[PDB]
């Protein structure tokens, strides 16, 4: 309960530098990296193998296992800098705005903005810079600079909305069985977003561009981490609502996915996360 | 100091007929893909990015990597039976051997034998034949049946002889700067067998040929545990007599190679695994 993660539209200038300069740090470290990798690996984790489900995403282990992901992100960032947690980036209050690209959370003492059409969509401002940040392929090789083209896509020309999330929180089954992106009436499934998709999570991918497009590069974008604080968020609060309810499959089914499973590439399992206050923060809205 | 890990060829039919059982246990758990996805990730963490070094091979973290690799393969095997170990492969005395294609390591009720030339050298005999034993790709897709083809390799026909191995027993470096494939009087570097070879290990791998033949698709051979678990224990006889010796560097080099850098995917630092009775094992005799 000690750690507050906070709005990023809250956070003093001095939260905000505070916050890039650590992941400056820990990138400079080596320390970064091993993030982009760790995701890189669970989506080619498929469970079962030959199964579209992977260990971090289209299948119940998603919400956890990013959890774990930003526990752990978090604690490194600790080690720099006690004072530092991870905020979240409300991005359904942003898609009220005329033009959401204006949000503050693209100022350039921040995320920095979107890309440099002239430059092949290119980031040039802000601290993670083409020149000042260096970025990952999907093989392990540098690629050449962080690339956004905000709303560029015809599937997803604009961010998720406050009601399509207070209707996600609804939901009363966390997950359904079979345990996939057709998974009906599933809170999991629906945060995901894949019925008539790209809908919540799926689609703030979609909308950002560059490498948060493509799903095995998003991390190498900073940015990445705030929307998963939101995603983990908006999880903590169904947790919240329907407390009666729990971690779906308990048992039966695939390896990876179940309740106890060991989520790879760690030890850790959906269990040792569910209660995220138990793990030592918790957001602002309470 | 406990658990013991035995030569192969010192193996009673009923313990090995144990390991066989464990490991298709441990395959249907879905514990095994564990083992050989970390071995692929490892592969793809370049050490720094862009680099000729990655978390596990190619540089000094080699080592210390593998015998954390198969320090907790080897406690997921106790969970299943605690009585099973990981025996180890010497496969300095096989190459002394007319033919050591028949070397008791490649029966029909341990590790099976050569591929067959009439089915694209698919493993068709023991436990781990096609149909019994699936496999998986560089991408973590289905590919469905091990290939093994020995010696049918013009750079590597023969099994590192014995004598590599006590003249790499000699070199009084754990390894040196820059650290990678041009180390030079490295004893890591020997032992991977990369320079002036393949040497070794760089050469055990490509003796096997099929999926031992790339290093992203080791793992799915059994042996490959087999065969690292006799690495680990040539560096545990360097560490006996060049005792006073370490790990380098220690201080300096890439992160992730460094004694106190966790070594990706894990936390574990090689310092962590310098001592590997303090890991609660050991090597008979």
């Given amino acids: 309960k000690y750690r507050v993660r906070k709005n990023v539209l809250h956070l003093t200038d001095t939260e905000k530098r505070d916050f890039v300069r650590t992941v400056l740090i820990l990138k400079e470290k080596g320390i970064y990296d091993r993030y982009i990798a760790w995701h890189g690996a669970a989506g080619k984790f498929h469970t079962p193998p030959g199964s579209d489900r992977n260990a971090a995403h289209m299948s119940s282990a998603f919400l956890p296992w990013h959890r774990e992901y930003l526990l752990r992100f978090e604690r490194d960032l600790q080690s720099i800098n006690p004072e530092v947690t991870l ?12 033009d959401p690209s204006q949000s503050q959370i693209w100022s350039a003492d921040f ?113 990445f981490f705030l929307h998963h604080a939101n995603v983990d968020r908006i999880w903590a609060v169904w947790q919240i609502i329907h407390r009666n309810q729990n971690y779906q499959p308990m048992k039966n089914g695939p390896f990876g996915q179940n309740f106890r499973d060991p989520m790879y590439p760690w030890n850790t399992t959906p269990e040792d996360v569910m209660n995220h206050r138990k793990l030592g923060y918790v957001y602002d809205i309470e």
């Fill in 111 to 223: 995320m920095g903005g979107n890309g440099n059409p002239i430059k092949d969509f290119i980031v040039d401002t802000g601290p993670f810079a083409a020149g000042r940040w260096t970025t990952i392929d999907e093989q392990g090789n540098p690629s050449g600079g962080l690339k956004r083209n905000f709303g560029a896509t015809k599937e997803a020309p604009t961010l998720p909305t406050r009601d399509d999330v207070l209707n996600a929180l609804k939901i009363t089954q966390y997950d359904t069985p079979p345990w996939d992106m057709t998974s009906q009436n599933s809170f999991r499934n629906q945060l995901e977003g894949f019925i008539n998709g790209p809908q919540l999570h799926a689609r703030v991918h979609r909308w950002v561009g560059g490498q948060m497009g493509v799903v095995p590069t998003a991390p190498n974008d900073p940015v």
């Fill in 87 to 98: 905020p979240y980036w409300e991005w359904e209050t942003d898609a009220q705005m005329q």
